[PDB]
Structure formats: C-alpha cells, structure tokens
Amino acid sequence: GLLVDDAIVVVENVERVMAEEGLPPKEATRKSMGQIQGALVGIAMVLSAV
Amino acid sequence: FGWFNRMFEKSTHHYTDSVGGILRSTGRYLVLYLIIVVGM
Amino acid sequence: DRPIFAWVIAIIIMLAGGLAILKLPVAQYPTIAPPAVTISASYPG
C-alpha cells in the first residue's frame, strides 16, 4: 500500500490544480508540492517513528 | 456523462456543510471520542 | 533559521545518547592487554 499512496497525492494534485486553477503546464505541478513539502518529509519521518 | 455527479452531490452539504454542522456543535464528540477510546 | 526544528534535533541527540548510556553497567577499563592464551598441564609427583 503506502508507496502507491504517497505517490497518489502528487499525481492527483496536478489533475486537481488543472481543474481548479486552470493553468495546464509543468508550473501546475511545481506549486502542488508547495503544499506537500513537509507532507512528504515529515510524514515519512513519523512513519519511521512507529 | 455523469458518474462524477454522485460524489459531487455528496461533497457539498452531505459532507462540506455536514462538517460545518459538527464544528457548529463539537460538544457531543468530547465524550464520543472517549467512548471510542475507552471502548477500544 | 526557525527554532522548533532545532529544538527537536536536540531531542534526537538527547534520546540517542540517553539510550547509549544504558550500557550500564559500564566497565572501568578499555582492554589494553596483548592477548594471553595459556596452556597448562599437571603431572603429579
């Protein structure tokens, strides 16, 4: 599971921002991970915590 | 056609304003959480 | 440089050394001796 689910967010977030923001290119991906910066590193650091 | 239509109706009110319904309340879940925690 | 991150790094270095002090009971020395393997036989009388 886990591995599919940590990747599902960044794949979806681009499909999410194109439907919302309207902007289609690479710059749409760019800003998605702006809200998933610690939601990748920190979550992994507390995944390992258990 | 409209398969996206089902959860879109579930999103607004049936989820969004439903959450705005229990944030309007809060009180009941101070003990319901404890019912879940001490129940487990 | 913000504080909350560093003040957690200290806790890692706190708990890592706090678990390493659990080498109790820690012996005085450090083995200095060049290894001594001894053979012994007894022929009575």
């Binding site: 689910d5 599902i8 | 809060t26 959480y33 | 991150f5």
Partner: protein, 183 residues
Amino acid sequence: GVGYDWTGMSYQERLSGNQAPSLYAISLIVVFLCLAALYESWSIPFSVMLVVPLGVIGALLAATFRGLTNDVYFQVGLLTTIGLSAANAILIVEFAKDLMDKEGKGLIEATLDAVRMRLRPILMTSLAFILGVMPLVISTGAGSGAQNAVGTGVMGGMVTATVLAIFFVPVFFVVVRRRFSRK
C-alpha cells in the same frame, strides 16, 4: 534443596509483554517529535497524534468479530494503519494550516476549504488500499493462515480509519478543538 528453574518457553525476556510497552513508547516519543518538523507548535502533534484510535477501533473489531487474535501480523498490521492513517490526517492538517498562516486566515471557513479539495486522495487512497488487502482477508483458506491474519487486521482497522477519520471525531477537531478553544 529442591530449587526451581525455567528453560525454553521461559523466554528468556521476550514475548509481547515487556516488548510492547517499550515498542509503542519510542513509537510515541518520535511520532510526537517529527510531527513538529516543518510543523512547530504543540497543536499539530495532537492534530494527528490522536487520530490513532480511529484506526485501532476497527482493527480489534475485525479481530474480535472474526475469531482472529493479537499476533505479530496484527501487531505490524496495527502499525501500518496508524501512520498510513496519519498520512491522511497530517495531510489535511497540512492543507488546513497552509490555508491559514501561509495563506489568508480560516478559523472555520478555510478548514472547510481545505477539506473541500482532497477527498479524492483520502478516499481513493483508501479504496485502492482496501481492495489491495482483499486478496489477503480471504481468497485463500488454504494458501496461508498468515495473509488472513495480516489482512483482516489492516482493512478492518482501515475502514474505521477512513470513515471516522474523513469527518467524525479527531479530524477537524484536530485543527479546531486541538489548537484553540484555549490558546
């Protein structure tokens, strides 16, 4: 002069007891800790830390209402559905506190906006998960008694970690009830 002693099953020093209280202990001192990395305050490590019983509740429900019992596969099965459940809570708490602070306010009226655009992941993440653990829960009553023990403890603990963690108790009360009302 009859003095007792213990041997093989007499452990020695192992089991689940004297293992679990030091297992979850440092699985709590660090769970709280790195939940402050890029997160900071004493708020957020309750905005996630306390979403754990939403996972457990269904895991024992799956164990008790089936006949299965607390083994190693249920032990680690309880452990996966706890950080995986976090990866949804800490994910919406991210969306929430990034809608505040870094963005422009939202005591109640941006917590909704945060939880208005990600129910795709939080549900399809779970949907692909539930069904991925479905060949484990049964499918084989001969191939393994291990896949059943590993799988039932997951999805049972997952369904409640999905439905009760999508709208019910801890969630939202995580950024509202567990941040303010006091400070």
